[PDB]
Amino acid sequence: MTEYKLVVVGACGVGKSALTIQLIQNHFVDEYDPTIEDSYRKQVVIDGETSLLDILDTAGQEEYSAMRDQYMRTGEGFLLVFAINNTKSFEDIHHYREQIKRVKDSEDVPMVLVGNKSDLPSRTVDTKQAQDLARSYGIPFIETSAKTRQGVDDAFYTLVREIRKHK
Ligand SMILES: *CCC(=O)N1CCN(c2nc(OC[C@@H]3CCCN3C)nc3c2CCN(c2cccc4ccccc24)C3)CC1
Numbered sequence: 001m002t003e004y005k006l007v008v009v010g011a012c013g014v015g016k017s018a019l020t021i022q023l024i025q026n027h028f029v030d031e032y033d034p035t036i037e038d039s040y041r042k043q044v045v046i047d048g049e050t051s052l053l054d055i056l057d058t059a060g061q062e063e064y065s066a067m068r069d070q071y072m073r074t075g076e077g078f079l080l081v082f083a084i085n086n087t088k089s090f091e092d093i094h095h096y097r098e099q100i101k102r103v104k105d106s107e108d109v110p111m112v113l114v115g116n117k118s119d120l121p122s123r124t125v126d127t128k129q130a131q132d133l134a135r136s137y138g139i140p141f142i143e144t145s146a147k148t149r150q151g152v153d154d155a156f157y158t159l160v161r162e163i164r165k166h167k
């Protein structure tokens with residue numbers, strides 16, 4: 001059975017853990033421990049294909065040991081996550097995409113831009129700002145809520161479709 005190694009990246013507080021746990025365990029977590037970095041497995045079906053998803057929810061501390069490089073490099077696709085009510089988190093996306101390109105030593109790595117917390121009023125990042133960042137990377141943009149499940153399957157599934165295209 002085909003396995004997909006997906007890595008969820010982005011600033012603290014954007015909902016990497018809440019999206020990963022909504023997908024895998026179908027509930028919404030308040031203030032998940034930001035020190036906990038885990039891998040989560042899920043049998044799913046995308047375009048009629050029963051696949052195994054191996055999903056790394058990144059956490060802890062920013063650090064660049066060989067060992068961290070090697071654990072991130074196992075990633076076949078990346079969710080670049082920001083929160084639509086957090087402009088600083090959107091302005092950090094470029095950093096995560098640069099570190100992805102470095103450890104994969106490639107200008108073409110399957111990625112999806114995810115604008116999370118779309119159930120919230122008082123958005124500070126507009127749809128157009130995030131569609132233009134994603135068009136600048138040649139990658140898709142999907143709007144999610146870890147809380148209502150809006151777009152959650154579609155963000156993960158769209159990343160899988162990106163990895164298939166790369167093959
Ligand atoms: C709140 C806890 C949490 O979820 N995380 C801690 C911060 N983590 C993290 N943060 C950054 O950068 C923070 C900002 C952005 C610009 C400079 N800095 C002030 N960068 C990374 C991480 C996780 C580890 N990262 C990393 C290490 C090695 C290789 C790669 C390759 C590809 C992507 C990331 C890599 C970078 C994580 C979340």
Ligand SMILES: Nc1nc2c(ncn2[C@@H]2O[C@H](COP(=O)(O)OP(=O)(O)O)[C@@H](O)[C@H]2O)c(=O)[nH]1
Pocket residue numbers: 010011012013014015016017018019029030031032033034116117118119120144145146147148
């Ligand atoms: N309303 C709402 N809150 C969210 C969403 N995603 C995450 N949160 C909350 O935002 C906070 C940070 O999310 P968390 O999953 O810890 O993000 P992480 O640090 O990137 O893993 C927690 O209190 C979450 O419950 C969302 O889509 N909508």
Ligand SMILES: [Mg+2]
Pocket residue numbers: 016017018032033034036057058059
């Ligand atoms: Mg977390």
